[model samples]
Target chain A: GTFSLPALPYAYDALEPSISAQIMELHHSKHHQTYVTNLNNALKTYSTALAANDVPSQIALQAAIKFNGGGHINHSLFWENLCPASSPDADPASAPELTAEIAKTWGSLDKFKEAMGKALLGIQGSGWGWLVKEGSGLRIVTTKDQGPVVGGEVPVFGIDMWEHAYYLQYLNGKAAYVDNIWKVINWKTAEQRFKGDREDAFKILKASL
Target chain B: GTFSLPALPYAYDALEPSISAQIMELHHSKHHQTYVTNLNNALKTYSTALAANDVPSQIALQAAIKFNGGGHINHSLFWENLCPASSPDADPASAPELTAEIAKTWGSLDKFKEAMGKALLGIQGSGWGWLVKEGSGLRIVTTKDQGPVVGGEVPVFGIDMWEHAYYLQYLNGKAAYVDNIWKVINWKTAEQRFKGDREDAFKILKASL
Candidate 1:
């Protein structure tokens, strides 16, 4: 396998109340695992196509690569940037440096959440809301359907806005899910990624085995 | 209101066993209703932007218009293209013309259904799979996230692939939903649309009030 499902940093029920155990279990075990399986299959075929100079075949496979590849990358980051609300890492104080920078940029942590929440709500379909660093400046962005943060930006953390991410628990009450997600954001990892390079932040996307 | 949720042609529970009454209730009253509400609001603001020659504002409103407007159009067609499995319209004999054309195009009705089912399942995120008429010929097509079919084609019928369309009932078992949907397809309406103009097929998208 070119890629494998990364284990969640905490137990499925650890982020409960904010994210349900059932939602976590399915999202990680079923959804994320499917992406890993499909991506490996796509890459193997893509390599064969490349060696054979099968341009049309390779072109046809691009969608699978991008969709499944991005799924792997985005979910890997998603699981890392979330911890139990009861954990110290979920506290803003645990991310002192990134918290101050966020305050300076968005006026305050409350205001930043407001902006990100608005972005999350406005997404028309399956996608993600991201807090990312572009050089020394921070900005909010969104990506559609497993699209990842590239183009020289470091994704500090991301909130999965796919209906599967919250539909089982929240249904059409997406605003409630957006409101509750902040409770489990792992700020310690956010601070670490904020201080690191995009390469380091996205290293999990590369093959380690 | 510029756009309003269209009433389902049959009782919400009429499609039971194929699509649950609970899923139908929420998908129509909640999901489709929200699109109508937002499209109306966005168009009102868009008119103001146009009057003031605010190009940027008009550009900003394009996304909302396309997204919400397409949502309204797609859902309206979706409802019309579905009937209870018990309904007379659900029979292939009711769509003799379209059925023969489909057989001629894809070898047989079963082959067409298989092809369309594959297209529906292959869609990566929120979207629709359509059986559309192009000129005198027919083809299977797909659109991304509320994107309506508008490029010189008549959408005979479409299957909504959004998670909201089936997730409440099917969970991650999307294949089952795809298999069951054929049971409720309004082949009578599909035949009528196959013989009609694109304008007639999409007239529900226009402001009739």
Candidate 2:
């Protein structure tokens, strides 16, 4: 396999109450694992297509690669940027620099949370809402389906807005899901991301294949 | 409102033991209703943008219009082409012409079901698998995330691949959902669609403003 599922820093039940244990298990094991499996298959097919000079087949395989690949990348980042509510890393004080930066950019941490929640709920379908570092400032953005951030933005942390992320526990109560997610956010990881390069965020993709 | 939520001919629980009552109620009242609400709002903005000649705003509104408008169009057709498993319309004999046509095109009704199921499961994210009438022949195609079929094909029927459509009832058992959906398909409506034009499928989108 070209990629592998990254280990979650917290236990499956760690994000409990905010995110259910059942949701975490299925999301990481079933959903994320499927993406890794499919991405490997797609990449293998892509290699074969390239060797055979089958341009049409190669072109057709791009959608699969991007979708599965993005799924892998996004979920890998997602797991690392979340912690148990009880962890000190989940608190704002643990990310002092990032907290001050967010205030400088969005006036206050509360406003930033509100803005991100709106972006998450406003998504029309399967997608993600990202707190990205654009240029020298922090900003909020969204990517459709499993698309990752682009245009040289560093994805500090992302909240999966896909139904599988919250539908099991939240149903259509997406706003509540958004509001609750803030509690489990790993701010220490976010601070590291705020100071890191894009490659730093996606380093989990480089497996010992 | 220019467009409103159309009534489901069968009760929410009518398709039970396959699609649950809870899934139907939320999918219709919450998910489908949200699309209707957003489409009307988007269209109103588009009208204002058109009057003011705000090309950028009008251009920006296209994604919302297509997404929400297609949601309204697709869900309306979806409701009409679904019925209780006990209904006479759910039988293949109720759609003799279309059944024969499907056999001629795909060799057998079973083959068509298998093909459609593959298409449904193959979708990487939110989408639909449609049985469409293309030039006197029936074909299976998929549309990404609320996109309506184009190139003048008459959508005979569509199975929503969105998680919201089946996640509540099926969880990650999408393959089971795909297999069970056949039990409640409205073959009579499919027959009418085979004999009718594209307009016949989308007439629910038109209401007296």
Candidate 3:
């Protein structure tokens, strides 16, 4: 099935200082919504082509499905992953286990931050920052465009570094947005994800053996 | 500073079935080396403009620096991350603490693998699969083109999913490459990274704080 946009966890103004309300409103309502609308149209076109068994049309629509669908999926995640200025604070003590794992893997929370910052600023154009589980360990990763995680990794946290994600507030200054977004991270949700994964691991091991 | 291609960790043919010797030879000697060469040329052009204080020239060179330099740095990491098919097997029992942490965060090793696979296959075009550290957690992320991760995150694992990374072996069948590369993963190096990060966490924390 084609993907759909998920609602934001907080109001547009919830993530302030880090992400302005104006930017959130435009990003969600305009940019992200546009992707969703366009993707749906593309999918519809693909379905029609498939019904007619039109090989050329089907081939042409493949690009649309990929680009528009990817845009829709990426933007949908982007909106939920961020909060506006008034969002609730993330409790570190109750943060996701992945946080602790990252600390263990990176040598410190700050180092992880630095690496992420570098990755974000290093982008030549649009991209994202991600914390993924890899081979029984957690690792910091980055991807450009709409590349996702490998099939087996679990995503604990992510930040969209696209200009659309910050340009309205920070303009050409992506550093500003990168520096500010920390205030709105939903550590509580992240923690739950970590716990859930721990449980899943045991179940999988049992099944494998 | 401009990025340059680093030497491969092993000779071309070292990876065998997981990655044919032919693919490695072409990937490293041809593709990666080309990025390094182009990056150097781009840098020279940019440096001359900067030295002469020519704004337009500098602006024009920005794209070149971004494309070429990003390719150089990314490919360098890609080559080092992969190992010969004859590399040692992964030892789950001896997994580093970070691996345990990943299990705790993601539920199971298999799940993490699934996540990574999904991410890799989901990529729209050329990009990388990144496992990044955020604050104290880890996440899976993707990027398009030469987009880099944010500066605040730590990149621990990366998989280049661009067609160039596997096209010679798998052609347009990206799934085949994704499925096969697992055999050549440098699990030993990955474990070392986990151990190193765990040992250094404190120092990193202090610096960030």
Q: For model 1, what is the alpha-carbon lDDT of residue B196?
A: 81
Candidate 2 positional error at A149, Å: 2.6
TM-score of each: 0.95, 0.92, 0.51
- Candidate 3 chain B: worst 10 consecutive residues by lDDT? B200-209
lDDT of predicted model 3: 0.65
Off by over 4 Å in 1: A197-209, B197-209
Q: Of all true interface contacts, what fraction is found in model 2?
A: 0.64
Q: Is the docking of candidate 1 incorrect, acceptable, medium or high quality?
A: high
For all the predictions, what are the DockQ values? 0.81, 0.71, 0.05
Q: DockQ score for model 1, please?
A: 0.81
What's the C-alpha lDDT at position B156 in model 3? Answer: 55
Better of 1 and 2 by lDDT: 1
- Give the range of the ten consecutive residues with the poorest summed lDDT in model 2 chain B: B200-209
Ranking by TM-score: 1, 2, 3
Better of 1 and 2 by DockQ: 1
Residue lDDT tens for model 1, A85-137: 99999998998899999999999999999999999998888999999999869
For candidate 3, give the DockQ.
0.05
Query: How far off is residue A41 in model 3, in Å?
Result: 20
